Subunit: 264 residues, 3 copies
């Protein structure tokens, strides 16, 4: 088996091309680069520069105004390296220019994430309980980190995670070995998460990955709604060590009352 991380054009997938290859990739690797999805180094520059400007030239007062009262990294500024997070609502923006630039950037990320997830579902003949569109109108989280192992091995609990980033620190398990994941100015890196594995009945792999040890990274988590419902027996069938009584359960029943993005 070739341990090369493949690349797929979103447009070609939506045209019904490379279906066998796509299904194979999802099952055996669970990761791939995605082109023709409206996201490149171009649509990233604007957002990157303005947030970097904020991280470097923003005053403690300005940063305070966009910092949540609890340091959860859900919205606004966070000092972990620095981070800026946002979602579909309840956002914290430092300026009008910043808001316009980041709202557009977030929208493009959310659109691309839903589109590729839509293809993952179609290629596996998966109809989520409640329908595809209700499943995809969810609870995304975008996190931009600035770093002027650096992250332990783990897998994502998202449906899919889109990464842009800017030495190759990011590595993922492929074929049984850690493969480097360099940036592609013309594409976005896609990691399938445990929810893709769960909703498709085990047809999709959620690969482990980590960051080895100055750069920036944009991570977009497409996460299901709390009421997303699934089959308990089926979950057991593909590796989930669930402690759920009954035949069906929700994302909330499984993970709890607070979103958990990664797992070791």
């Amino acid at each position: 088996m070739d341990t090369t991380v493949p690349t797929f054009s979103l447009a070609e997938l939506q045209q019904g091309l490379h279906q066998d290859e796509f299904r194979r990739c999802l099952r055996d690797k669970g990761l791939f680069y995605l082109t023709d999805c409206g996201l490149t180094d171009t649509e990233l520059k604007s957002a990157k520069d303005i947030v970097i400007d904020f991280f470097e030239h923003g005053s403690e007062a300005e940063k305070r105004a966009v910092t949540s009262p609890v340091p959860t990294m859900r919205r606004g500024f966070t000092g972990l390296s620095m981070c800026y997070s946002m979602g579909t609502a309840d956002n914290l923006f430092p300026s009008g220019d910043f808001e316009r630039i980041w709202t557009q950037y977030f929208d493009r990320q959310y659109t691309a994430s839903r589109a590729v997830a839509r293809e993952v579902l179609r290629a596996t003949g998966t109809e989520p309980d409640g329908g595809v569109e209700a499943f995809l109108d969810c609870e995304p989280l975008l996190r931009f980190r600035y770093f002027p192992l650096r992250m332990a091995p783990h897998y994502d609990l998202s449906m899919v995670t889109l990464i842009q980033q800017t030495f190759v620190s990011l590595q993922a398990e492929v074929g049984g070995a850690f493969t480097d994941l360099p940036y592609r100015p013309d594409a976005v890196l896609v990691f399938c998460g445990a929810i893709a594995t769960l909703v498709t009945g085990g047809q999709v792999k959620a690969p482990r990955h980590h960051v080895a040890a100055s750069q920036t990274s944009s991570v977009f988590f497409l996460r299901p709604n709390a009421d997303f419902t699934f089959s308990v027996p089926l979950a057991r069938e593909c590796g989930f060590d669930v402690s759920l009584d009954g035949e069906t359960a929700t994302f909330q029943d499984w993970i709890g009352g607070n979103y958990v993005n990664i797992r070791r």
Copy 2:
């Protein structure tokens, strides 16, 4: 903005003084020293000496008699450095003298914690679902540690946490930088926790803190009851990344079936 950790007299607060300054502190810093609350180095000496005596001169048999069958550090003796924990009931005391001394010490800590939390609620015009007194008649946990980073950065999930302690190891984020928190023989240190943030609708900050690397520390967590109820949309509004279906939820729905005191 001045990054000085302020001090407030509990008596003066209860008199309606320094309200604007108190509200400001709660919002921008989330920590402060508290005087005139019935807790000083005097009321600590008795408890400290007797527990230290136990840690140093107690036999393995005597320690066994006050050690829980599961090493949870909820009640009795624990060997992590050593620790002694207690609550409102189901306690484990090694001697009659010990029980009298620590029951009085616990009562003073619980009274002071409820009193300052009462002021936090009043200064923010907060009426918890179910009322103030039902909210404050809760599930406190007192932990005394003896140490004859030493603790990773985190925030507390309590309403408020009171610390006495005895080189300055304790540090908290203030103004965007770690500020030392030395002991005050005449005051107790108060950290606001995530529940203060939650119940007040985001009017209170839960500051991150840690312990840098021989001394003793008394930590009192004022924790809500499992059935404490709050608004889900409001929680989302102040930074909580909740995965809760519906409009209202309980502490148990959010955190789960076991108390969690801190979060990184």
Copy 3:
């Protein structure tokens, strides 16, 4: 008190012998070696050799065929050192010979685990809610690790955990000090877990242990069903820091929707 890790013959226990000594051990130590339970170095050789052969001579393709889409270590092969896991159903076997050998090995482990747990319940006069047999027909997990501190201090959340293994790395807290736990070709090592503490009302200790830093170890967790029910007030009485509203709760209510095997 003697800090020696005792040994009990399962057959002698089932005959009503050494009851006081057994109860004492369960209360003060929570661990012991078990002989005459159908498990020795003999019944381990076959399984060990064949899995070692797989770990060393198995191709990436063969390992892939028995690897779950999510890296949970619940079933099949896992590359953490390597590991092979199995349960009562939904298993992944690389060959017919492997399946026959490991199914028999698993059955012997499950039978021995239920038998000793049955004795733990009898010696403490414990009748689980719903009855003994329903409690023991549960959700076991067997994990075989190959290692051609190595594990932080923790306690198990199982009813009981059986260990075989093959310098003494394994250590447990006994009498207030870490005692080495060498292998016994004629016996299996038994650690009592938090569920034994819980179901017996605090009559059984769940000892902390860890692995100091090439060998193999077989760990069998006898875990309760999600619907196992217990008394909340009683749980509080023996050290469990539960945040459960009401008088009764289930394992799922306490731990959540995913099994958790250990706790620090």
